[PDB]
């Protein structure tokens with residue numbers, strides 16, 4: 195699919211059997227989701243953004259099904275205004291910017 | 294130009310006669326740059342990102358030359374770890390996401 199940017203590039207994803215909308219964020223190095231349970235041992239980490247830094251939990255090799263594709267990679271969990279699909283998963287689907 | 298996401302999608306831009314690198318950010322609704330002066334009257338505003346909110350100065354109708362293209366739109370000035378090209382200017386260059 196080709197996605198314009200006139201509106202927020204939100205996509206429906208399936209992660210750990212839960213349905214969520216996430217933002218295709220080329221400005222996000224990593225993927226972060228709002229609170230939820232995930233499989234595996236997680237290490238507490240901290241991420242930094244525009245308005246400050248955020249303490250969160252890091253999970254490795256998490257399966258997300260995004261708009262019909264599948265990817266496995268690091269997913270961070272913590273308070274975010276949006277679920278964000280960072281570049282760690284965008285590359286796996288071969289996502290690119292064009293103009 | 295086609296841009297993959299294995300590396301940060303930074304581009305060289307020319308704004309107010311100054312050369313800067315900025316992040317092509319599909320997750321950013323608006324464009325924000327680190328401190329600098331700009332033409333016109335600015336209204337103080339506050340933006341909200343991951344980890345908190347940030348007070349900034351809003352400027353309207355600002356010309357940025359991005360990788361050979363020209364755009365005019367709202368640019369916000371404030372303390373950000375990166376200069377970010379939000380969707381308010383990405384649409385003007387016809388930027389899209391593809392996969």
Ligand SMILES: CC(C)CN(C[C@@H](O)[C@H](Cc1ccccc1)NC(=O)O[C@H]1CO[C@H]2OCC[C@H]21)S(=O)(=O)c1ccc(N)cc1
Nearest residue numbers: 219221222223224243244276318320321322323342343374
């Ligand atoms: C939090 C999102 C819903 C929106 N953000 C855009 C996003 O691309 C930022 C843009 C960004 C880029 C670098 C630094 C701060 C913010 N990237 C980001 O938060 O990524 C974080 C998760 O992965 C890591 O990658 C770096 C930061 C971490 S935002 O920076 O806060 C933002 C919000 C509104 C406007 N008008 C402009 C920018």
